[PDB]
Amino acid sequence: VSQVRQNYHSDCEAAVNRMLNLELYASYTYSSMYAFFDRDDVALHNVAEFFKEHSHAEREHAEKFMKYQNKRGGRVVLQDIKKPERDEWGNTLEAMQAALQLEKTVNQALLDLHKLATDKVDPHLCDFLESEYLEAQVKAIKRIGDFITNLKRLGLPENGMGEYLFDKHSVKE
Amino acid sequence: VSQVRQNYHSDCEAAVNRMLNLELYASYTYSSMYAFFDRDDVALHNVAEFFKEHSHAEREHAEKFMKYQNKRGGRVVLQDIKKPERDEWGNTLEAMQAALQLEKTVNQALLDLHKLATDKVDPHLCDFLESEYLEAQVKAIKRIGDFITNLKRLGLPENGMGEYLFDKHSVKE
Amino acid sequence: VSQVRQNYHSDCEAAVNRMLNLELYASYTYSSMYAFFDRDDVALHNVAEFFKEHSHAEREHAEKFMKYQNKRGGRVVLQDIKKPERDEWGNTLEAMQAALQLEKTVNQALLDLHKLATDKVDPHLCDFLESEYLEAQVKAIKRIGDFITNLKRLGLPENGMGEYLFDKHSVKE
Amino acid sequence: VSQVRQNYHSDCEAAVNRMLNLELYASYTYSSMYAFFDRDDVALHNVAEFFKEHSHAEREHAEKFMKYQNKRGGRVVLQDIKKPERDEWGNTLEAMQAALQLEKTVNQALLDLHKLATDKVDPHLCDFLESEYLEAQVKAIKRIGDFITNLKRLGLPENGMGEYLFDKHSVKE
Ligand SMILES: [Cl-]
Ligand SMILES: [Cl-]
Ligand SMILES: [Cl-]
Ligand SMILES: [Cl-]
Ligand SMILES: [Cl-]
Ligand SMILES: [Cl-]
Ligand SMILES: [Cl-]
Ligand SMILES: [Cl-]
Ligand SMILES: [Cl-]
Ligand SMILES: [Cl-]
Ligand SMILES: [Cl-]
Ligand SMILES: [Cl-]
Ligand SMILES: [Cl-]
Ligand SMILES: [Cl-]
Ligand SMILES: [Cl-]
Ligand SMILES: [Cl-]
Ligand SMILES: [Cl-]
Ligand SMILES: [Cl-]
Ligand SMILES: [Cl-]
Ligand SMILES: [Cl-]
Ligand SMILES: [Cl-]
Ligand SMILES: [Cl-]
Ligand SMILES: [Cl-]
Ligand SMILES: [Cl-]
Ligand SMILES: [Cl-]
Ligand SMILES: [Cl-]
Ligand SMILES: [Cl-]
Ligand SMILES: [Cl-]
Ligand SMILES: [Cl-]
Ligand SMILES: [Cl-]
Ligand SMILES: [Cl-]
Ligand SMILES: [Cl-]
Ligand SMILES: [Cl-]
Ligand SMILES: [Cl-]
Ligand SMILES: [Cl-]
Ligand SMILES: [Cl-]
Ligand SMILES: [Cl-]
Ligand SMILES: [Cl-]
Ligand SMILES: [Cl-]
Ligand SMILES: [Cl-]
Ligand SMILES: [Cl-]
Ligand SMILES: [Cl-]
Ligand SMILES: [Cl-]
Ligand SMILES: [Cl-]
Ligand SMILES: [Cl-]
Ligand SMILES: [Cl-]
Ligand SMILES: [Cl-]
Ligand SMILES: [Cl-]
Ligand SMILES: [Cl-]
Ligand SMILES: [Cl-]
Ligand SMILES: [Cl-]
Ligand SMILES: [Cl-]
Ligand SMILES: [Cl-]
Ligand SMILES: [Cl-]
Ligand SMILES: [Fe+2]
Ligand SMILES: [Fe+2]
Ligand SMILES: [Fe+2]
Ligand SMILES: [Fe+2]
Ligand SMILES: [Fe+2]
Ligand SMILES: [Fe+2]
Ligand SMILES: [Fe+2]
Ligand SMILES: [Fe+2]
Ligand SMILES: [Fe+2]
Ligand SMILES: [Fe+2]
Ligand SMILES: [Mg+2]
Ligand SMILES: [Mg+2]
Ligand SMILES: [Mg+2]
Ligand SMILES: [Mg+2]
Ligand SMILES: [Mg+2]
Ligand SMILES: [Mg+2]
Ligand SMILES: [Mg+2]
Ligand SMILES: [Mg+2]
Ligand SMILES: [Mg+2]
Ligand SMILES: [Mg+2]
Ligand SMILES: [Mg+2]
Ligand SMILES: [Mg+2]
Ligand SMILES: [Mg+2]
Ligand SMILES: [Mg+2]
Ligand SMILES: [Mg+2]
Ligand SMILES: [Mg+2]
Ligand SMILES: [Mg+2]
Ligand SMILES: [Mg+2]
Ligand SMILES: [Mg+2]
Ligand SMILES: [Mg+2]
Ligand SMILES: [Mg+2]
Ligand SMILES: [Mg+2]
Ligand SMILES: [Mg+2]
Ligand SMILES: [Mg+2]
Ligand SMILES: [Mg+2]
Ligand SMILES: [Mg+2]
Ligand SMILES: [Mg+2]
């Protein structure tokens, strides 16, 4: 037993490792989206940069779980980071729809971990999730949903002018 | 009788209380418009913020009537603030059309109060309305009318690209 | 279903709308207290300003619930804002006693909403209440209680000199 | 006829001269109050300074009527400035009560002049009164009324401690 460990269930330790992996998986998916929108035959650079930044944020989320694991006396156990589900992402609308679903998948895993922490009477882990993850996730989901609404309004997928306008006026330039 | 009261007719006092209520009603309607445009399935945030700011301005108009009532020695009497006429506002054009009509309703009440003040030979109340309300109202009506003209030019309600462009280029970002 | 909605029970959505209304009701009550203490025959302007500021804070609390509702994919539904229970507030002690009871009523509604969120296993809503409302409410209740103790010490309601001194030395000038 | 005169009735010209005199009379009354509160056996120096400043304001009001008369092509005609009604002013409450009545007397004369200007269809004179006099008068009346309420609360005339406290905490130090 680690000398620091106190009130930290094995099941929570394992679930933190699985969360770590999911954040890295999300990072990798966003990096694929970045590379897609940077292609010369796609060429939506503000969209590309939105996804690149989101890829970096997900890696930071993973690193924070590594630090957490060690603070509690658990042990980081890594697994392969699976490649993203697609090699090409269609257009801004398809990518944003995939991002929404990814963020909801990550959110569900965070909520499931919170429920496990509750069941194991681990208020430190509950606080960590509430203070560092759950609100960021709700904000990200709302932002992407708002974008999808605007992309539909702009006539995606068919309306290329609408897609251009979104890249120039909705995503940080 | 209040020790400060001079040349202040009971009818004017009552009409100031009714005006106070109407300004609060207008504030509440604009707050509903804010919440509508902030929905994830509407997502026109500059439009939402335009209405939020207008909601705050109307509350300030109400507070100025409270202060006025007390300065003249009248007594503030509050009534329920009725909920807005609609729960959802359609789109930017429908909302702006409703805002125009609301501003004209408020303007008519201000003009009616000015006429009452004239009839009761109350130049202080006439000056207050002319100096603090009537020009602001004309300016607001002109601004909203100009917006409606532009929304129609942009093809509202059908043209979603036009609606997007209005949010990005006509309302403060 | 809203595209953003996840783990948000209909009962919580409805209870957030009812909370929104209660915050607006509290705002309106404080605005009535402001207007009362600004009367020429009351004339306790620091007390009046204390209540005016509290009225603005309550409106901010309501607006934060509107934003929350939309972030979760719920729908803001507004109801009439009922007028305050009294048209005149007696004196500083009576008003502060009414404010204490109002703050405790709002606190109880917040606690009830937290219990509902707990029952529906909604940690995001629990965090929101704990981080944005519950401590502010405890602080406000303590402040008003401290004021009541001092008003009683100063001989309210009978001791007008005590009431004057409170306005000049306990409330921000 | 003055080369500048246009739309300026003889009756209004005369009434402006009478107003000029009344403002000077009010100034002189306030100067008497200043001297009273500066007596060694009264010795309420913040109260004294309040009245001294008000004396200067009234003289400025008179000078503005002189300038107005000349701008319109009327002719300033001066009369004796009558001494104040009392040689001694009792205490802060009695003085403030006299000041309230004086301000209401001046207000009534301003309102009467506005009515004359209205009857003679003189919008420039109406604007001048509304823009330069009527609101200042309402503000002054409200301020003095608020003071009287506080002096009564403080137990004037009997409560000398209350009178001391008013001088130290209600009037600019
Ligand atoms: Cl342990
Ligand atoms: Cl334990
Ligand atoms: Cl264990
Ligand atoms: Cl593991
Ligand atoms: Cl694997
Ligand atoms: Cl996918
Ligand atoms: Cl693919
Ligand atoms: Cl997914
Ligand atoms: Cl889990
Ligand atoms: Cl726990
Ligand atoms: Cl967070
Ligand atoms: Cl957006
Ligand atoms: Cl957008
Ligand atoms: Cl009257
Ligand atoms: Cl009159
Ligand atoms: Cl009347
Ligand atoms: Cl009324
Ligand atoms: Cl009603
Ligand atoms: Cl409507
Ligand atoms: Cl509706
Ligand atoms: Cl209307
Ligand atoms: Cl009216
Ligand atoms: Cl008039
Ligand atoms: Cl105006
Ligand atoms: Cl325009
Ligand atoms: Cl453009
Ligand atoms: Cl425009
Ligand atoms: Cl749900
Ligand atoms: Cl869940
Ligand atoms: Cl549900
Ligand atoms: Cl509801
Ligand atoms: Cl109702
Ligand atoms: Cl009550
Ligand atoms: Cl009452
Ligand atoms: Cl209550
Ligand atoms: Cl509840
Ligand atoms: Cl929970
Ligand atoms: Cl809080
Ligand atoms: Cl205290
Ligand atoms: Cl003191
Ligand atoms: Cl205190
Ligand atoms: Cl003439
Ligand atoms: Cl003419
Ligand atoms: Cl003439
Ligand atoms: Cl003359
Ligand atoms: Cl004479
Ligand atoms: Cl006298
Ligand atoms: Cl005398
Ligand atoms: Cl008099
Ligand atoms: Cl006259
Ligand atoms: Cl005229
Ligand atoms: Cl003025
Ligand atoms: Cl005062
Ligand atoms: Cl005072
Ligand atoms: Fe993440
Ligand atoms: Fe994420
Ligand atoms: Fe208004
Ligand atoms: Fe308005
Ligand atoms: Fe543009
Ligand atoms: Fe509140
Ligand atoms: Fe509160
Ligand atoms: Fe003091
Ligand atoms: Fe004057
Ligand atoms: Fe005066
Ligand atoms: Mg060891
Ligand atoms: Mg284990
Ligand atoms: Mg996994
Ligand atoms: Mg594989
Ligand atoms: Mg629990
Ligand atoms: Mg937080
Ligand atoms: Mg946003
Ligand atoms: Mg009275
Ligand atoms: Mg009446
Ligand atoms: Mg009405
Ligand atoms: Mg109804
Ligand atoms: Mg103006
Ligand atoms: Mg313009
Ligand atoms: Mg949908
Ligand atoms: Mg429902
Ligand atoms: Mg309720
Ligand atoms: Mg009722
Ligand atoms: Mg806190
Ligand atoms: Mg304290
Ligand atoms: Mg000549
Ligand atoms: Mg003449
Ligand atoms: Mg005279
Ligand atoms: Mg004489
Ligand atoms: Mg006029
Ligand atoms: Mg004017
Ligand atoms: Mg003015
Ligand atoms: Mg004041």
mmCIF file with all atom_site columns, N, CA and C and ligand atoms in Angstrom, chain A residues 23 26-27 30 54 57-58 61 99 102-104 106-107 110 136-137 140-141 144, ligand 56:
data_model
loop_
_atom_site.group_PDB
_atom_site.id
_atom_site.type_symbol
_atom_site.label_atom_id
_atom_site.label_alt_id
_atom_site.label_comp_id
_atom_site.label_asym_id
_atom_site.label_entity_id
_atom_site.label_seq_id
_atom_site.pdbx_PDB_ins_code
_atom_site.Cartn_x
_atom_site.Cartn_y
_atom_site.Cartn_z
_atom_site.occupancy
_atom_site.B_iso_or_equiv
_atom_site.pdbx_formal_charge
_atom_site.auth_seq_id
_atom_site.auth_comp_id
_atom_site.auth_asym_id
_atom_site.auth_atom_id
_atom_site.pdbx_PDB_model_num
ATOM   1  N  N  . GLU A 1 23  ? -9.462  10.396 -22.304 1.00 0.00 ? 23  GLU A N  1
ATOM   2  C  CA . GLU A 1 23  ? -9.045  11.763 -22.609 1.00 0.00 ? 23  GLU A CA 1
ATOM   3  C  C  . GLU A 1 23  ? -7.972  11.778 -23.707 1.00 0.00 ? 23  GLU A C  1
ATOM   4  N  N  . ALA A 1 26  ? -9.652  11.122 -26.976 1.00 0.00 ? 26  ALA A N  1
ATOM   5  C  CA . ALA A 1 26  ? -10.326 12.333 -27.446 1.00 0.00 ? 26  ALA A CA 1
ATOM   6  C  C  . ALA A 1 26  ? -9.301  13.304 -28.036 1.00 0.00 ? 26  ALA A C  1
ATOM   7  N  N  . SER A 1 27  ? -8.166  13.464 -27.366 1.00 0.00 ? 27  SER A N  1
ATOM   8  C  CA . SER A 1 27  ? -7.100  14.324 -27.894 1.00 0.00 ? 27  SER A CA 1
ATOM   9  C  C  . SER A 1 27  ? -6.700  13.903 -29.301 1.00 0.00 ? 27  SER A C  1
ATOM   10 N  N  . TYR A 1 30  ? -9.237  14.772 -31.978 1.00 0.00 ? 30  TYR A N  1
ATOM   11 C  CA . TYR A 1 30  ? -9.170  16.184 -32.337 1.00 0.00 ? 30  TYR A CA 1
ATOM   12 C  C  . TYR A 1 30  ? -7.938  16.500 -33.170 1.00 0.00 ? 30  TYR A C  1
ATOM   13 N  N  . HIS A 1 54  ? -8.351  22.158 -29.104 1.00 0.00 ? 54  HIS A N  1
ATOM   14 C  CA . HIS A 1 54  ? -9.087  21.175 -28.325 1.00 0.00 ? 54  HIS A CA 1
ATOM   15 C  C  . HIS A 1 54  ? -8.296  19.883 -28.071 1.00 0.00 ? 54  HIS A C  1
ATOM   16 N  N  . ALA A 1 57  ? -6.106  20.655 -25.122 1.00 0.00 ? 57  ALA A N  1
ATOM   17 C  CA . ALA A 1 57  ? -6.890  20.680 -23.883 1.00 0.00 ? 57  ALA A CA 1
ATOM   18 C  C  . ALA A 1 57  ? -7.140  19.271 -23.382 1.00 0.00 ? 57  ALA A C  1
ATOM   19 N  N  . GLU A 1 58  ? -7.490  18.353 -24.279 1.00 0.00 ? 58  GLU A N  1
ATOM   20 C  CA . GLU A 1 58  ? -7.736  16.974 -23.858 1.00 0.00 ? 58  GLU A CA 1
ATOM   21 C  C  . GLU A 1 58  ? -6.479  16.330 -23.295 1.00 0.00 ? 58  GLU A C  1
ATOM   22 N  N  . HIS A 1 61  ? -6.203  17.467 -19.845 1.00 0.00 ? 61  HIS A N  1
ATOM   23 C  CA . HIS A 1 61  ? -7.144  16.728 -18.997 1.00 0.00 ? 61  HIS A CA 1
ATOM   24 C  C  . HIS A 1 61  ? -6.572  15.369 -18.584 1.00 0.00 ? 61  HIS A C  1
ATOM   25 N  N  . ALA A 1 99  ? -17.631 15.745 -32.850 1.00 0.00 ? 99  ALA A N  1
ATOM   26 C  CA . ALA A 1 99  ? -17.092 16.339 -31.645 1.00 0.00 ? 99  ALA A CA 1
ATOM   27 C  C  . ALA A 1 99  ? -18.148 16.387 -30.551 1.00 0.00 ? 99  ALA A C  1
ATOM   28 N  N  . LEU A 1 102 ? -18.451 12.917 -29.172 1.00 0.00 ? 102 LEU A N  1
ATOM   29 C  CA . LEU A 1 102 ? -17.259 12.614 -28.390 1.00 0.00 ? 102 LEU A CA 1
ATOM   30 C  C  . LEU A 1 102 ? -17.313 13.284 -27.015 1.00 0.00 ? 102 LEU A C  1
ATOM   31 N  N  . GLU A 1 103 ? -17.662 14.570 -26.986 1.00 0.00 ? 103 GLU A N  1
ATOM   32 C  CA . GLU A 1 103 ? -17.747 15.281 -25.717 1.00 0.00 ? 103 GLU A CA 1
ATOM   33 C  C  . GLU A 1 103 ? -18.814 14.677 -24.815 1.00 0.00 ? 103 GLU A C  1
ATOM   34 N  N  . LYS A 1 104 ? -19.938 14.235 -25.387 1.00 0.00 ? 104 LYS A N  1
ATOM   35 C  CA . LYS A 1 104 ? -20.964 13.580 -24.577 1.00 0.00 ? 104 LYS A CA 1
ATOM   36 C  C  . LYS A 1 104 ? -20.509 12.213 -24.070 1.00 0.00 ? 104 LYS A C  1
ATOM   37 N  N  . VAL A 1 106 ? -17.341 11.419 -23.375 1.00 0.00 ? 106 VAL A N  1
ATOM   38 C  CA . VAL A 1 106 ? -16.421 11.745 -22.287 1.00 0.00 ? 106 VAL A CA 1
ATOM   39 C  C  . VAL A 1 106 ? -17.221 12.190 -21.060 1.00 0.00 ? 106 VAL A C  1
ATOM   40 N  N  . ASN A 1 107 ? -18.226 13.048 -21.263 1.00 0.00 ? 107 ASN A N  1
ATOM   41 C  CA . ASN A 1 107 ? -19.066 13.473 -20.147 1.00 0.00 ? 107 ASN A CA 1
ATOM   42 C  C  . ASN A 1 107 ? -19.713 12.279 -19.435 1.00 0.00 ? 107 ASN A C  1
ATOM   43 N  N  . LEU A 1 110 ? -17.236 10.625 -17.239 1.00 0.00 ? 110 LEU A N  1
ATOM   44 C  CA . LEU A 1 110 ? -16.985 11.438 -16.041 1.00 0.00 ? 110 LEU A CA 1
ATOM   45 C  C  . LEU A 1 110 ? -18.121 11.300 -15.028 1.00 0.00 ? 110 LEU A C  1
ATOM   46 N  N  . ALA A 1 136 ? -16.485 22.231 -17.235 1.00 0.00 ? 136 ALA A N  1
ATOM   47 C  CA . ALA A 1 136 ? -15.793 22.393 -18.509 1.00 0.00 ? 136 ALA A CA 1
ATOM   48 C  C  . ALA A 1 136 ? -16.489 21.564 -19.601 1.00 0.00 ? 136 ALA A C  1
ATOM   49 N  N  . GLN A 1 137 ? -16.943 20.369 -19.256 1.00 0.00 ? 137 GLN A N  1
ATOM   50 C  CA . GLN A 1 137 ? -17.585 19.526 -20.227 1.00 0.00 ? 137 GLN A CA 1
ATOM   51 C  C  . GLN A 1 137 ? -18.937 20.105 -20.682 1.00 0.00 ? 137 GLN A C  1
ATOM   52 N  N  . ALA A 1 140 ? -18.245 22.978 -23.018 1.00 0.00 ? 140 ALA A N  1
ATOM   53 C  CA . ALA A 1 140 ? -17.792 22.534 -24.337 1.00 0.00 ? 140 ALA A CA 1
ATOM   54 C  C  . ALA A 1 140 ? -18.940 21.985 -25.183 1.00 0.00 ? 140 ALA A C  1
ATOM   55 N  N  . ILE A 1 141 ? -19.814 21.213 -24.560 1.00 0.00 ? 141 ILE A N  1
ATOM   56 C  CA . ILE A 1 141 ? -20.983 20.671 -25.238 1.00 0.00 ? 141 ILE A CA 1
ATOM   57 C  C  . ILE A 1 141 ? -21.901 21.791 -25.731 1.00 0.00 ? 141 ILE A C  1
ATOM   58 N  N  . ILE A 1 144 ? -20.256 23.590 -28.805 1.00 0.00 ? 144 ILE A N  1
ATOM   59 C  CA . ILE A 1 144 ? -20.337 22.805 -30.031 1.00 0.00 ? 144 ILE A CA 1
ATOM   60 C  C  . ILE A 1 144 ? -21.775 22.727 -30.532 1.00 0.00 ? 144 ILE A C  1
HETATM 61 FE FE . FE  E 2 .   ? -13.346 17.581 -24.366 1.00 0.00 ? 56  FE  E FE 1
#
